[PDB]
Amino acid sequence: PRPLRLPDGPPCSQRSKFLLMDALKLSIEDPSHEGEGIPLYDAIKCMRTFFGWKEPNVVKPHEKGINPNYLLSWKQVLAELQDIENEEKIPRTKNMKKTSQLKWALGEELRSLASWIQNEFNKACELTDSSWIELDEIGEDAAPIEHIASMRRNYFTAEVSHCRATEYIMKGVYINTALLNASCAAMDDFQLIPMISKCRTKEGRRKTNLYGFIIKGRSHLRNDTDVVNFVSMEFSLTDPRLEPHKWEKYCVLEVGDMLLRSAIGHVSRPMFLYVRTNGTSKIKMKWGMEMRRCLLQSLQQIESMIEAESSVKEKDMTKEFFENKSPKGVEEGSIGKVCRTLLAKSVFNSLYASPQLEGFSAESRKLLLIVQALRDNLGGLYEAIEECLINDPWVLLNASWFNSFLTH
Ligand SMILES: Clc1ccc(-n2ccnc2)cc1
DSSP: OOOOOOOOSSBOOOOOSSOSTTOOOEEEESOOSTTTTOHHHHHHHHHTTOOOEEEEEEEEOOTTSOHHHHHHHHHHHHHHHHHHHHSSSOOSOEEEOOOHHHHHHTTOOOOBOOTHHHHHHHHHHSBOSEEOSOTTOSOOOSSOOOHHHHHHHHHHHHHHTTBHHHHHHHHHHHHHHHHHHHHHHSTTSEEEEEEEEEEEETTSOEEEEEEEEEEEOOOOOOSTTOEEEEEEEEEEOOOTTSSGGGGTTOEEEEEEEEEEEOSSSEEEEEEEEEEEEEEEEHHHHHHHHTTTHHHHHHHHHHHHHHHHHHHHTTSOOHHHHHTTOOOOSOTTSSHHHHHHHHHHHHHHHHHTOOHHHHHHHHHHHHHHHHHHHHHHTOOOHHHHHHTTOSSOHHHHHHHHHHHHHHHO
C-alpha cells in the first residue's frame, strides 16, 4: 500500500571501485611499440600521447584525508615513470618506493538519493563508438552451439558489444585480474598497476586505453576476506566542484589541460585526477574477474522472453523479437535498449554489490508479487525492505524505481 520511505540526509556519494561516467582515457591506436601488450609499456606510451601536463594542485580536498600526501603520491608516480623511461629495458612491473605519503595512503549515516546515480545508469545504457568484446565473447560452452542459440547470441551481441556497460565489464575484468595477480606475485611491494582497457574502433582499428593507475599495498591474503588496500588515481574531465557531494571520498587534483574537438571548434579544458584510498579482497577480485557473466545473465533474461513468446505462438520468435516485427512496440524505445538496460542493471549490480542490495532485492520482490496480486484481483515486510535503505546510491535508486512501479 504505502510507497517506500527513502531516508533524508546529505546526498549519497560515489562508492564504485573506479570511475564510471566520469572516466577519461589516454589511448594509442594500432599499438606496435617494443613489448606491446605489457601493461607498463602501454601505460607509458599512453602517457606520452599527452603533452598538456602541468604542475599539479589540489582543487577539491578530501575532507577526512591528508591532502598533501595525495599530491605527493601523484608526483611520485610521474617521477617513477620517468625513471622507467630511463632504464634501458622497460621492466615488466614497477614497485614504488615506500615513501611516507604512500605508507600513509595505503594504511601501513543516513544519505538521501542524489541525481548522479540515475545519470550514471543512463550513461551505462548508452552506445559508445567502439566495440569492447569479440563476436564469440559470450558463453563458455564445450560444444558448438545450436542454430537458434547462435542466432540469439549474435543478435544480442550486436546490441551490447558497443554498450558502455560492456566497457565497464572489460575495464573491471582487467583491473581486478591485474590486482589479484599482483597481490600474490608481489605480496610485499607497493606495485604500480595501470588501469587499462582495449577496444576496436568502428573502422576496425585496435586501441589500447589508459584510465589511470592504482598502487597496491601489502597483500598477504591468507583467505578470501583479507583486504588489500590500494590508492586509485584516475583521469577525468569532470570538474568535481559541480557536484562535490558525489566526491566525498576523493581528493581531486588538476593535473593538465587537454585540447578537444567539440560543437565549437577546438577548446582547451582542464584535466583532473581523482584520487582516493580504497580496498578489496580475494573474493571480490574473483567476482570482478567474472564480470563477463553479466553478458550471459542478461542474454539469458532476453532468451527467457523469447521462449515465452515462442510458446504462445508455437514457433520460434527469435527473428520477430530482435527485428521488432501480440506487442506493437517496445516500451524502452527499441529492442537494443531493452538488451542494454538489462545489461546495465546486471553490471551495476556487480559494480555496486552489497548486502543492502541483496536484502532489498529479495524483500522488494515479495512486496512486488503481493502488490500485483492485490492489483489484478481488486506491515513488517516494509521494515525488512526499508532496513536496507540507508546510504547506498544503487539501492536507493532501485527503491526510487520501485516507487514509480507503485504509482503506476
Ligand atoms: Cl610517462 C610520463 C609523462 C609525463 C610525466 N610528467 C612529468 C611531469 N609532468 C608529467 C611523467 C611521466
